[PDB]
Amino acid sequence: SLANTYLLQDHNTLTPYTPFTTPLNGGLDVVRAAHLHPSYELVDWKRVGDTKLVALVRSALVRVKFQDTTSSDQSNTNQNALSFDTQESQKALNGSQSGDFASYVLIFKAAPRATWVFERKIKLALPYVKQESKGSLYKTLQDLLVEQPVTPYTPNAGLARVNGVAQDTVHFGSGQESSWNSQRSQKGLKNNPGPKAVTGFKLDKGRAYRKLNESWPVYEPLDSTKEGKGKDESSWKNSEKTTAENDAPLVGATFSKYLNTAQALHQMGVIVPGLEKWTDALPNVITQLYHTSTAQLAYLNGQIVVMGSDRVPSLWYWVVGEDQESGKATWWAKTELNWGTDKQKQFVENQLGFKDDSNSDSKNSNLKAQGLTQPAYLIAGLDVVADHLVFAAFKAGAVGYDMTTDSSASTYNQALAWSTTAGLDSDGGYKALVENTAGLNGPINGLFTLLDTFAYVTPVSGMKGGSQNNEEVQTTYPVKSDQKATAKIASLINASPLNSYGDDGVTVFDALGLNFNFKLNEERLPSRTDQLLVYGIVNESELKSARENAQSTSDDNSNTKVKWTNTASHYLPVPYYYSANFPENGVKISTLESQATDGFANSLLNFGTGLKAGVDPAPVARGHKPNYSAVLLVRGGVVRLNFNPDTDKLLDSTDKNSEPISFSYTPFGSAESAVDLTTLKDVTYIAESGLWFYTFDNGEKPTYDGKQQQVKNRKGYAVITVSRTGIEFNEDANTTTLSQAPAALAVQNGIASSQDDLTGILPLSDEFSAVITKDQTWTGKVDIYKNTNGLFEKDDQLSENVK
Numbered sequence: 189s190l191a192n193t194y195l196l197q198d199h200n201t202l203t204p205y206t207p208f209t210t211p212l213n214g215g216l217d218v219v220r221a222a223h224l225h226p227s228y229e230l231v232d233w234k235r236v237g238d239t240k241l242v243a244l245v246r247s248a249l250v251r252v253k254f255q256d257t258t259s260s261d262q263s264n265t266n267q268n269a270l271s272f273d274t275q276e277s278q279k280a281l282n283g284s285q286s287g288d289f290a291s292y293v294l295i296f297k298a299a300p301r302a303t304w305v306f307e308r309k310i311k312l313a314l315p316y317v318k319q320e321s322k323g324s325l326y327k328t329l330q331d332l333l334v335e336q337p338v339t340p341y342t343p344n345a346g347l348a349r350v351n352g353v354a355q356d357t358v359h360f361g362s363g364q365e366s367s368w369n370s371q372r373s374q375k376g377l378k379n380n381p382g383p384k385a386v387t388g389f390k391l392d393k394g395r396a397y398r399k400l401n402e403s404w405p406v407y408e409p410l411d412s413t414k415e416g417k418g419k420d421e422s423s424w425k426n427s428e429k430t431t432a433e434n435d436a437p438l439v440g441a442t443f444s445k446y447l448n449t450a451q452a453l454h455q456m457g458v459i460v461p462g463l464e465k466w467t468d469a470l471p472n473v474i475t476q477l478y479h480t481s482t483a484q485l486a487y488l489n490g491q492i493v494v495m496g497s498d499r500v501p502s503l504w505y506w507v508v509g510e511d512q513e514s515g516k517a518t519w520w521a522k523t524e525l526n527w528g529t530d531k532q533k534q535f536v537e538n539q540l541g542f543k544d545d546s547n548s549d550s551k552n553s554n555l556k557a558q559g560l561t562q563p564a565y566l567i568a569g570l571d572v573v574a575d576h577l578v579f580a581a582f583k584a585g586a587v588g589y590d591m592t593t594d595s596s597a598s599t600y601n602q603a604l605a606w607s608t609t610a611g612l613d614s615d616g617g618y619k620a621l622v623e624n625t626a627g628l629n630g631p632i633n634g635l636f637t638l639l640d641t642f643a644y645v646t647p648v649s650g651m652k653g654g655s656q657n658n659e660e661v662q663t664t665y666p667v668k669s670d671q672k673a674t675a676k677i678a679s680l681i682n683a684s685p686l687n688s689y690g691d692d693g694v695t696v697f698d699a700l701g702l703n704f705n706f707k708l709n710e711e712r713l714p715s716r717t718d719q720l721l722v723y724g725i726v727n728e729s730e731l732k733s734a735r736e737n738a739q740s741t742s743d744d745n746s747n748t749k750v751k752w753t754n755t756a757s758h759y760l761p762v763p764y765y766y767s768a769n770f771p772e773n774g775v776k777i778s779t780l781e782s783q784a785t786d787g788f789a790n791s792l793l794n795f796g797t798g799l800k801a802g803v804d805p806a807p808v809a810r811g812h813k814p815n816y817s818a819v820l821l822v823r824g825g826v827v828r829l830n831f832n833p834d835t836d837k838l839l840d841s842t843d844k845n846s847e848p849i850s851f852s853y854t855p856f857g858s859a860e861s862a863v864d865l866t867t868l869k870d871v872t873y874i875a876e877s878g879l880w881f882y883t884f885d886n887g888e889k890p891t892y893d894g895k896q897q898q899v900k901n902r903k904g905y906a907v908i909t910v911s912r913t914g915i916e917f918n919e920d921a922n923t924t925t926l927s928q929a930p931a932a933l934a935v936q937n938g939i940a941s942s943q944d945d946l947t948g949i950l951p952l953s954d955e956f957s958a959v960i961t962k963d964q965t966w967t968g969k970v971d972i973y974k975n976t977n978g979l980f981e982k983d984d985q986l987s988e989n990v991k
């Protein structure tokens with residue numbers, strides 16, 4: 189309708205367009221309208237109702253700090269260890285000219301014409317954590333290790349971290365490993381067929397792992413097996429920093445040992461000084477986490493949610509009241525989510541670190557010892573529907589590591605992570621497979637050779653062990669029985685959905701989804717830690733609980749969790765055909781080549797981007813509430829998340845063996861596989877047509893690659909139409925329970941170019957859509973496109989008519 193206006197974004201300016209493909213005025217520069225500093229950048233905005241506009245702004249000059257050790261009581265009050273450092277904010281100002289810089293949620297109100305009047309601003313404060321002089325999350329943060337982010341130029345070998353020591357040498361030792369079977373019963377590994385099963389990966393070499401107050405380096409290794417220092421900050425700081433500088437320099441030099449990804453970091457949410465719109469080192473890891481934890485938002489009946497970036501893991505999220513001026517963040521570490529079953533929740537928790545009633549060490553800082561759940565997630569997106577919030581995220585790999593000073597220790601300088609893929613002898617049906625004991629508490633998977641046919645998963649699992657096939661197949665944490673009280677396992681977090689980075693085919697099969705059973709009814713065996721997708725519907729009362737958790741000043745509720753019961757996990761691997769060696773001795777991570785075109789140099793790690801909810805316009809049954817489902821885009825396919833509208837819960841069936849109806853993955857075609865997932869600038873859903881539109885701006889690609897060469901195909905656009913498929917819930921009268929999950933379908937409709945810069949796209953009608961282009965002076969090249977079922981092509985007559 190002529191009366192309705194479409195809002196298009198250009199940096200900070202929100203220009204309102206008419207269905208005549210013309211602006212109604214210059215637009216609204218949110219930064220200036222909110223009376224904020226020029227360093228502020230607009231990242232996410234949501235049009236609320238008709239008389240409201242909510243936005244998300246973040247300054248690159250923001251500087252955060254975590255105060256660790258050297259303190260006493262008597263004078264120290266209820267102060268937060270996480271606080272804004274104004275000292276470095278005024279120091280970082282030196283860029284061009286001037287004449288806490290915290291993120292803000294902005295509220296606007298509609299005035300006559302296409303104008304907005306500034307109403308109020310809500311401060312997005314740091315999450316609360318009690319300082320020191322089993323209720324202490326502070327210890328975890330004191331000894332926390334976070335990996336440098338994954339760039340679209342990071343190759344497969346860059347993630348490949350050298351395999352650790354087997355659990356037979358951990359519990360027994362070097363020289364007496366041959367007594368595995370004869371003594372595994374009393375050690376807690378009864379019928380365990382995995383002696384040479386790798387416990388994790390070594391941390392002495394590879395991609396840098398930096399603490400909260402330490403900083404991520406711009407240079408990353410091509411092959412983490414040969415080059416890189418990993419956790420060793422002092423080894424980098426003293427000689428390897430200069431090694432990476434001379435070999436990998438910025439444009440202003442062989443590139444054989446390291447890669448310069450400064451441009452790639454900036455185009456993710458990472459603050460890179462000297463490379464901004466308006467050598468040295470990048471800001472604190474805790475500061476980068478804050479700058480990346482403010483990328484997405486949603487508004488519900490007076491509540492504003494804020495979540496992290498889809499490329500950088502977020503350790504917290506905001507839930508702030510409209511009336512509130514401030515509002516501290518809620519941790520994911522204190523947010524208990526339903527993983528589908530009680531066993532599915534266990535797998536991830538029982539890898540976060542070491543926990544036993546024997547240990548009570550100050551250096552035993554791991555989440556499990558501090559009684560905390562999964563702390564990080566790569567938020568694919570969020571949305572609101574039927575007075576309820578809906579989210580989807582790729583669970584970031586949070587594991588443990590040995591902080592021992594004893595170099596002779598087998599687990600010394602290594603992170604503990606094992607393959608959690610269900611055994612080959614596991615019972616059929618989703619529930620029976622996801623609940624399988626295979627690596628619940630410790631390693632079990634690895635290379636098992638059956639005559640001449642090798643298998644990367646355990647052939648003996650559950651309770652089918654022993655002789656009579658009744659004996660339990662035991663599994664336990666890779667820490668020696670007598671070393672349990674003195675154990676100092678801390679917490680480590682990865683920048684990908686992988687728990688394990690160990691250079692082996694077992695971790696390759698978890699990432700690519702190649703673990704199957706030898707049954708005629710071939711079922712794909714699931715990982716319960718690697719390539720995991722979390723999704724769920726959260727209500728206003730569950731949301732309020734997250735706010736109250738953040739607003740708490742330690743006191744008694746320093747351990748208390750946020751209960752989100754309507755959530756579930758799902759094993760979502762990358763396609764195998766995305767990797768060159770498996771097309772449509774063996775191989776490991778480093779030996780895996782990439783043939784991936786979706787704007788990723790790695791054919792190993794998965795990426796979930798741009799989630800959007802939507803109410804199916806289809807006529808519903810006599811009484812029943814209108815059906816709704818949320819859709820997101822992953823590597824190699826479209827995934828639809830279904831929900832029950834009559835109860836505002838996750839859609840579940842009568843039979844537990846049958847795969848969940850709440851989850852559905854539809855793999856997409858050849859044309860849509862050439863689409864870069866990182867270039868997504870907008871996700872629009874049309875209520876009247878029931879179609880999703882994924883608008884990819886080529887300009888969202890960085891300036892230079894890892895080898896500091898100008899990025900090609902930066903000019904252009906590509907659109908993906910996502911439509912519903914299959915039988916829906918309450919499609920007719922007799923439709924009660926569903927056996928097959930209602931899915932979606934991704935197709936590159938026809939709205940695509942590689943020669944023009946995109947201003948945006950206007951959905952004029954169900955039949956016609958417009959394409960506004962940039963580049964030259966003024967900007968306003970309009971192109972009218974027509975469709976049928978979804979096939980798009982430009983109407984030469986109407987395009988020439990507007991122009």
Ligand SMILES: CC(=O)N[C@H]1[C@H]([C@H](O)[C@H](O)CO)O[C@@](O[C@H]2[C@@H](O)[C@@H](CO)O[C@@H](O[C@H]3[C@H](O)[C@@H](O)[C@H](O)O[C@@H]3CO)[C@@H]2O)(C(=O)O)C[C@@H]1O
Nearest residue numbers: 369380381382383384385386632633634635636637638647
């Ligand atoms: C993850 C892991 O470490 N798997 C092991 C497995 C498991 O230990 C086993 O499945 C359960 O205990 O054993 C593997 O060992 C076999 C392998 O070394 C082959 C090599 O040819 O030999 C087999 O032994 C045979 C062989 O004929 C002689 O060595 C022996 O005198 O008789 C045996 C037959 O009775 C080993 O069992 C396996 O691949 O199955 C090695 C894995 O690393």
